[PDB]
Design a protein around this motif. Structure first.
Motif, short mmCIF file in Angstrom:
data_model
loop_
_atom_site.label_atom_id
_atom_site.label_comp_id
_atom_site.label_asym_id
_atom_site.label_seq_id
_atom_site.Cartn_x
_atom_site.Cartn_y
_atom_site.Cartn_z
N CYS A 152 -4.11 87.04 59.97
CA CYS A 152 -3.60 85.92 59.20
C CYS A 152 -4.71 85.23 58.43
O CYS A 152 -5.80 84.98 58.96
N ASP B 230 6.81 88.65 54.00
CA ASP B 230 7.04 87.28 54.44
C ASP B 230 7.29 87.26 55.94
O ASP B 230 7.61 86.22 56.51
N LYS B 231 7.15 88.42 56.58
CA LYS B 231 7.39 88.52 58.01
C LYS B 231 6.09 88.62 58.80
O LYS B 231 6.12 88.79 60.02
N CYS C 138 2.47 86.85 59.96
CA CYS C 138 1.80 85.56 60.06
C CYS C 138 2.75 84.44 59.65
O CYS C 138 2.58 83.83 58.59
N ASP C 139 3.75 84.20 60.48
CA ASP C 139 4.74 83.16 60.20
C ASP C 139 4.08 81.81 59.93
O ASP C 139 3.37 81.26 60.77
N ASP D 26 4.50 78.21 56.77
CA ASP D 26 5.50 77.45 56.03
C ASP D 26 6.22 78.38 55.04
O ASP D 26 5.60 79.22 54.38
N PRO D 27 7.52 78.26 54.93
CA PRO D 27 8.32 79.13 54.03
C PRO D 27 7.85 79.10 52.58
O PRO D 27 7.88 80.12 51.90
N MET E 256 5.20 81.37 52.26
CA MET E 256 5.62 82.74 52.56
C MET E 256 6.64 83.27 51.55
O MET E 256 7.10 84.40 51.67
#
Ligand SMILES: *[C@@H]1O[C@H](CO)[C@@H](O)[C@H](O)[C@H]1NC(C)=O
Length: 106
Positions: free
Chosen positions: A13, A40-41, A43-44, A46-47, A50
């Motif tokens: 990440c 976008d899957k 290193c989760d 903030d959306p 991502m």
């Protein structure tokens, strides 16, 4: 140890350091790598950061190659001044694919 049977690969990440290590007396040989975001899957975070799944950085490969090529192990910062900026405001990452070969012969 216990090879994957399909090239070695490490991902980290953005902002955290990454670690590469080859078994026995083999040396890391960077084949391909990129710094950015293509998923976008991973290193989760903030959306909003991502949302963009399209960011590539070819030079990312040369940086890791020079740093890990011919070495048994190498550590690099998957961010900071160790990597330019191909996409700001987005949560990036670093993916590096490489193989481990003997430092000499057999
Ligand atoms: C690794 O060693 C080989 C043989 O000495 C050399 O050809 C190669 O260039 C070295 N790696 C790099 C990045 O130069």
């Amino acid at each position: 140890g216990l090879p994957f049977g399909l090239m070695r690969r490490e991902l980290a990440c953005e902002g955290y350091p990454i670690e590469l290590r080859c078994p026995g007396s083999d040396v890391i040989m960077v084949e391909n790598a990129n710094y950015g975001r293509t998923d976008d899957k991973i290193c989760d975070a903030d959306p909003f950061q991502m949302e963009n799944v399209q960011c590539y950085l070819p030079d990312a490969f040369k940086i890791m190659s020079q740093r890990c090529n011919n070495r048994t192990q190498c550590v690099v910062v998957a961010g900071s001044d160790a990597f330019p900026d191909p996409c700001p405001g987005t949560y990036k990452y670093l993916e590096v694919q490489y193989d481990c070969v003997p430092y000499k012969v057999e």
